[model samples]
Target chain A: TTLLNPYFGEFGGMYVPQILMPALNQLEEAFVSAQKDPEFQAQFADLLKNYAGRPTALTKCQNITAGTRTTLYLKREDLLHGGAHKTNQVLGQALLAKRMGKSEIIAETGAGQHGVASALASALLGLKCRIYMGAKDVERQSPNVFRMRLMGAEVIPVHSGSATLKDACNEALRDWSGSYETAHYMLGTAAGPHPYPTIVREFQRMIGEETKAQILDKEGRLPDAVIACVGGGSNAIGMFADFINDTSVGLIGVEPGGHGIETGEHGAPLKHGRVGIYFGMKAPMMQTADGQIEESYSISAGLDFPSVGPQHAYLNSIGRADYVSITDDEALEAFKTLCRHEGIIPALESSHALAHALKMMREQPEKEQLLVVNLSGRGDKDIFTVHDILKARGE
Target chain B: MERYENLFAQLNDRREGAFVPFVTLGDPGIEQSLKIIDTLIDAGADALELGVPFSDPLADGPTIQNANLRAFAAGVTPAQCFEMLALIREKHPTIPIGLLMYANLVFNNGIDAFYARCEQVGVDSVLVADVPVEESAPFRQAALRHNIAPIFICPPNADDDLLRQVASYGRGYTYLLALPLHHLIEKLKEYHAAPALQGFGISSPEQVSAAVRAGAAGAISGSAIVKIIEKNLASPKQMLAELRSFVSAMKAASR
Candidate 1:
């Protein structure tokens, strides 16, 4: 049987060790079959609606966008169970793991949001789950560690290579290479090798589908633009999937600029990186001229990745989507603005998109544009981190 | 291809398997790295598989992973690695040298340009650790264009279709993932592929012997040799001596 195409233009390919080819092929087969099965679709849709709170509200910003000709709407993935759009794809992958008769789930996490979602899915499905988390992230996102542990998932701390998301991803891929027989690698983003980017995009595309319908119902037409944070671009890809065909609706992905692009310290690969292969796929990555992967920095752990998803690279390459970077200070101000003006706390990851949306409104006040920003997660898990930063600044 | 064919023919005449050794080029320092390669050749290594250090080596275990880090710590770059390869080629003109690295290193330099440099330095082959047979066409084409054989890995779980593809596209020698030492070697032979050289987890003399017994043309040991460097970084003489003894022991097992 012919398999699904593995490339997004010249970007996505199964760039893994030869030993893992069969496992990736098997996953692709399972995902393809599952996509065609009505029963599988029914089960996934039921779980999404009944358990994880699908059709999350698209809330219009009352005070935040009052001064501009912008009607900013927040796609409330924060209200979902496990508190993010991560749960949407995790549930789908866990079901596929069961369908494939795999009893274990191996996942990697950066900010612990994906870890929590994976842990919850495994618990619900009665599957064994082990999460590889960076040592630094395990400390920074202690609450997420507890959540995974509480769900009976073993959390492995990866101490190698910068001790962050990149290291965790490497460790998880290594583990999967050896343990793929009885384990399903529940990749946490729209990145990695072939089937992963495709599988993740398919599972999370519901975000865009729901938003499109909700926006049409409330605003009588599609929004002018759909904005989402682009870490490995899972949430953004999900929020951009259905809207991709609608030429009138612009897709904007906001990347994290830790200090500034000029300082070479940000996680804005689309802005500052070159096209290269790093973590399994050929995409834009932050690397040295000698082809060494560079360490990326961001105030938000979720956005601190050196490489982006392949589809995002393809989109940016073809000009189907526009990408911009938001500095840490800008994201922080947007975080505080939403909390005070709209009485809503947003994840720092989502704040990047919000910051960009606010910038567009400020830049073109008479444009009369309708903007939809994907609030990818809630900020309860980040309260302690934000509190420390604010306290150190005497705010 | 001719160098590899002649080497295998000579080894077959003596009723012995090839004992290849792999190391990250410029691991300790440029001078020390040259010494290490010279020592391996002097100790009767049949061929060489050299790694260009990359920041992210996902396919590697902790041992080889640390070796890559050490090479980076010594300020190794692709240019320096090519320079080292040129010096090695000058000293040992007939030795079949192959590069085992990630695709980014090759892609960063432009595929054709990278392969051209390999040909310029008399490097015989290249095996990109992350690019499997399905994604091997562009890389394979470039390798052929530059007369550098594109090595393909035969994993334990490979089906006939993949085996056929690997056999068709691969040149020089097939890299057998020691995840299976015997079955894959025989499987590749069925397709009339190039000689199979088992690698990964081939640490000791016994494993090398076992691989030869399993119909492998040879075996490549990497982590075992790099571990010695990791342990004896402070003393260069001791490191070379240990590496020599290790290669000598492995070479003896090729009988």
Candidate 2:
């Protein structure tokens, strides 16, 4: 494989401020060195299973019920300690930080998904984690606030103008300013600055590897397609990693259409964005005429993002993964449908992929076609919002 | 409403101290044109000018002409260049946006549409690369209706009386092309030869000091800033830092 250098042209690349450059460079070199050490990789894999809950269930949905379509299997990453696939990369980064002799792991989070993940790793591994979240997000995603507190992270709420993901990113960069020894900024997704986007992709690639193998073991062949949900696109990259070079298997990513995209009430960036660099990487983003980050909205906080991981763009340009969007209503429908029919209440973020798969299942073959999804999180946390939204929609 | 409009107004009232930051319009591509402007502003840039990137810019050296070809290869046209200025107008609204391009590209775009476009975009000034101030009457008249200032470049070869006469015609401020063709300032600083650059302008530490002593309203430093940035252009953070330092030196020159 071409090593599938993901965010070089698009998806994302390092876009950190000048003050953060030295630390970013050092962290990058550390990632390179760690990747070269086989002992580290083996220990890391062992930690993933025993510590971070690797070898997660690959539950195949029995469509024996009357007239169900495609064969769907869940790569249950949502069961990871932090409740998503970020644990894979977060732990790898946290371990890398320990190797680099860093005492603190600093991270910026928009919806607290990454904050919780990094904080979980910090608490488990005896590293201090400071997480920056937008003040608005601190209020909206208050559950993450509680989760971070319990995980023993110092969650700082950022309140800059456009106080959201980008501002949170800025705050994290400010905190990482000239402090590469005491801190290593473990970025949320496969993004920001150089080596970060590169390193995160490699760490996240384990998800893809595991997903590909489980599908092969169960179905006795490679999956027909690998589907995943995306905001910053880490999950999709994790799912799409092993499939990038696979010519026959389809790789698909579903983004949240926050509101109806027609009304511009959404976070469906790839379909509605221009090329801009942010979070230390270059990717598609909902930016203003002056290139300032714009506000983004999605029912799933983790899925409301302005920019995507750089590798998403690179994979798209290379025609590897087919990127698509799933509206809030459609995803909500899939969420309820799965809960009622399959007894699986998937996180709204993961419902995006479910919605895409359901839509495809409706249009495509109804036989034993394999569709693998990164069931990125358990839906328990978002149950409150779903009740209000489903009731409002009069469902 | 905009800070630079007020700043430029203040510069007009000042009896001393001016710093001009010049960047090649598309060395890094059209993407950074406005970004570079923003970085320059944040770093306290007093005034700004940039190259329009044209083939056969007779006055500029191989560095800039090559930069122009590179920009051209990247698909920057004279029209789109005007569009970028127009965008600057919508945001800044009141501040003067200057158009620096070769005479051929401007004339090819037509003095009517070209001057009309400049006026529409709130372009306060225009500099025709090869047009001598003595022969710039036609351009001045065409741009006059649109209230666009047709700035005339006074190279080192120009006389002292001509310098005052040309600066008098400028609507905003004079854009001085300090050196011929050049780049990589650290290398050029050691290799740059001092010449008549002192009279019309200055390149030396003492010459900018002397130009300050001699009372030039503004001293434009182009190649030096471009050279410093080219060394680390792959990284925006590094490039901005070097550009800020170079501008700091240029500002201190007059003092």
Candidate 3:
């Protein structure tokens, strides 16, 4: 019997063309072997500590938690080398690509965080790299596009359905189907086919492991809850992997409520969608009544996806984790508040989680809460979009 | 019961191979797609592959992807696709019609219901593009129950075990991906348990003749045919005339 099952309690499966299965199986075998190899582990750890700036500070919030009966902490993955937690798994997958004897890396990006991470890793490891980003995103995240190209990665714009992350992913999968023999598809998040979710989670599990240790050292007890944004759910899964067994801790995933769920202009699949298959995973997704994949909307491009990670779906289904939604307005408010109050500007993707945590604090101030928010990325890449949004709002 | 079995037997007796052409249902519109199917059949296509438009078709290249977009934009839904299939089947009952689509369409329609609808529409086989053999149990079982042949794609990189499994599991012909012209034909020639049909970038009469000579039972041309439709979308007469000549030339290659 196989030791690894793709499904996470009726959530994940390798829903891909038969042509890609051999490559996926090969990747899984390499990942399993790498997980057990101490040499691989040491190499990954060395890169994390030396190159990616690991042990990212779990900074305690000073001003944001002002009057509530709560103490807040920010898991500062924002300070990671590529300006996001995506760097964590990119290193592992890039190393896995090396182990698999692949010479090139193909990837898709939305907010361009993953593209930048893959570009840096490929540059360091001497692998050829190409990134597929949506044309819409290319125009919006031009700076990150420049950043990726500066690292010797070719950035290709995908003009397809919705012209967003999902489209970019579709294009990436197509390319890998033809090039899988020599190329490694470094899937950007903890979604897609089997080994990817499992692989991504393990690589990112360090986030939760570090957070657990940092929390215990600082407070001597686990926080009441942990919150992270859920765009394909890499950072949240990373931040939650270590604490999944701690039944007392509540795990919350914040989805991007683009405008509002009722407005039908949102990216909150868990909040306003049905079960369907897309992007190589069977999970809840934003689809039409007849199952056409609908275009999802979010001011923050990273979180603008129709579907969530299958593991997140499984977690929500079993009631192990709670999924909530925050509107674009609410996320922007939090994004601005954090910058003004704590002097820390967070990515709009991270602002979704921050917004919900602040809401929970205000709504139930009666409870003395200790909350950890996964500040998954810095806002330097997001300032331009934020300025346009502010300008549109007549600021 | 085996539509392909009978078709291949007849082709063998004629010392020829099968010529299967693919088209998206409701590409220009439902009525035009129906007429196009008739055109392919009239032009001597041995069988047909019909696509159900999906928003994301990862396995397909740009030509088929654009056709799907065109059909979807033309307001084609799964129910309408089945309706078109039913109409096409009523006109040509014996021709093997295989439904080619993504898993989400099947999943969204409910796997069993999707297959049952296929059965009602006289679909002889079903190929869910995204469902690999590892995760094909439910879909495969449903197809079997509906008496619809389950089609499996044999990728060029498959190991011996996967090839053996496909040999055992596939009911219709195996969809063979690109391989060296010499070896792939002989491999499939000896692989009589499951007939092989070469596809992907297979254009021109010479290529079809080569595949058949190499021992393929048939050859499928999708993007090549879809490309003609793409260019001739504004003129239905031109589209039909081009499709007729293309299918006829490919069919002539079968002999």
- Total backbone collisions for each predicted model: 0, 18, 0
Model 1 segments more than 4 A misplaced: B178-183
True contacts kept of each: 0.80, 0.00, 0.80
Q: Where's the lowest-lDDT run of ten residues in candidate 3 chain A?
A: A1-10
Cα deviation of A100, candidate 2, in Å: 1.9
Candidate 2 lDDT over residue span B1-255, tens digit each: 133345545755765455665666666678765776666665655656667765434345444545665676777766667677666656655444556665545555456777887666666667765455543666777877677666655443334445455645555554444233222112222322111122233344565665545434445555666665557767887887766665666666655
| lDDT, residue B126, model 2 | 72
Candidate 3 residue pairs in clash (backbone atoms < 3 Å): none
Model 1 agreement with the true structure over B1-255: per-residue lDDT tens digits: 578988999999998999998888988788998999999999999999999888888888777777877788888888988888889999998999999989999999799999998999899999999998878888999999999899988776778888899888998998877334456667678889999888868888898888888888889886778888989999998999898898999999899
Rank candidates by DockQ, best first.
1, 3, 2
**Model 1: per-residue Cα lDDT over A1-395, one tens digit each:** 23888888999888888888889889999999999999999999999999998889999999998778899999999999988899999999999999999999999887788898899999999999999988987887777799899999999998686677767778898888888999999988899898899999999999999999999999999999999999999999999999989999999999999999999899988878999977789999998988888888899988877899999999988999999999999999999999999999999999999999999999988889999999999987778878988999999
* lDDT, residue B115, candidate 2: 83
Judged by whole-model lDDT over C-alpha atoms, candidate 3 comes out at: 0.88
List the global CA lDDT of all models: 0.89, 0.68, 0.88
Q: Candidates sorted by TM-score, descending order? A: 1, 3, 2
How close is candidate 2 at the interface, in terms of C-alpha RMSD after superposing the true interface residues? 19.3
